């Protein structure tokens, strides 16, 4: 086509989606990770995770307001990944890399899994 | 912080949100523009438009499944802008620039209004 493109549009959209998350505006699901609860937008979760994409395209699960993750999932690892989904920034540290990678594999977040594997390979 | 960032994340999120729109997945509102109807995600509309941000943060309007725009609004201008919201690409043409700018002013989409004003100034 003959379209023009606004370079910062996608980033500005995500920044606004994160502002809505911070103020709990139009969040439509609670993700339960053991004793912790995380409110989010189903569409954003689906856009970032192969697991959430599969869950919310399911004709029955699409209508659930609460999703319980596998008990092996670490709440901090999930929190770091939820922040990444809404910001593009990943808080990857020596103390959390194993939990973050395990959570990203479960959530089917391929690019996060890739950088975790590379950071781990560098320290061996 | 000591975060790393995935450059393409925001773009990939928006691409996935547009795929959901194309398959009518988790769309939660219909925007009526005269005889035309456009299905969309309230969160995406709010993230792109000052008008939709104000509408869906309203305690009563936040629960509406149908929003009727002002009858002066052109359905093609709205369609071009809805596509821009979900893709960052604006199909700006000599034949549609006036309708697109009028719609972007109504929707409170400042960057679109700015490029329309510049393209119009160049042709005078």
């Amino acid at each position: 086509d003959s379209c023009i493109q606004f370079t910062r549009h996608a980033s500005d959209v995500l920044l606004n989606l994160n502002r809505l998350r911070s103020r709990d505006i139009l969040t439509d699901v609670v993700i339960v990770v053991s004793r912790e609860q995380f409110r989010a937008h189903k569409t954003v979760l689906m856009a970032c995770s192969g697991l959430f994409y599969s869950i919310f395209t399911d004709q029955l699960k699409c209508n659930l307001s609460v999703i319980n993750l596998d008990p092996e999932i670490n709440p901090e690892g999930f929190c770091i990944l939820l922040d990444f989904m809404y910001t593009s920034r990943l808080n990857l540290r020596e103390g959390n890399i194993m939990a973050v990678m395990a959570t990203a594999m479960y959530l089917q977040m391929e690019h996060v899994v890739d950088t975790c594997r590379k950071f781990i390979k560098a320290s061996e | 912080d000591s975060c790393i960032q995935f450059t393409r994340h925001a773009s990939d999120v928006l691409l996935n949100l547009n795929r959901l729109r194309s398959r009518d997945i988790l769309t939660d509102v219909v925007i009526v523009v005269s005889r035309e109807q456009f299905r969309a995600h309230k969160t995406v509309l709010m993230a792109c438009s000052g008008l939709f941000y104000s509408i869906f943060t309203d305690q009563l309007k936040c629960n509406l499944s149908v929003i009727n725009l002002d009858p002066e609004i052109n359905p093609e201008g709205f369609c071009i802008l809805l596509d821009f919201m979900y893709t960052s690409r604006l199909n700006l043409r000599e034949g549609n620039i006036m309708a697109v700018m009028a719609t972007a002013m109504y929707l409170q989409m400042e960057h679109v209004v700015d490029t329309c004003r510049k393209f119009i100034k160049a042709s005078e």
């Binding site: 023009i4 493109q5 | 690409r89």
Partner: peptide
């Protein structure tokens, strides 16, 4: 704005 750019030419994509």
């Amino acid at each position: 704005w750019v030419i994509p």
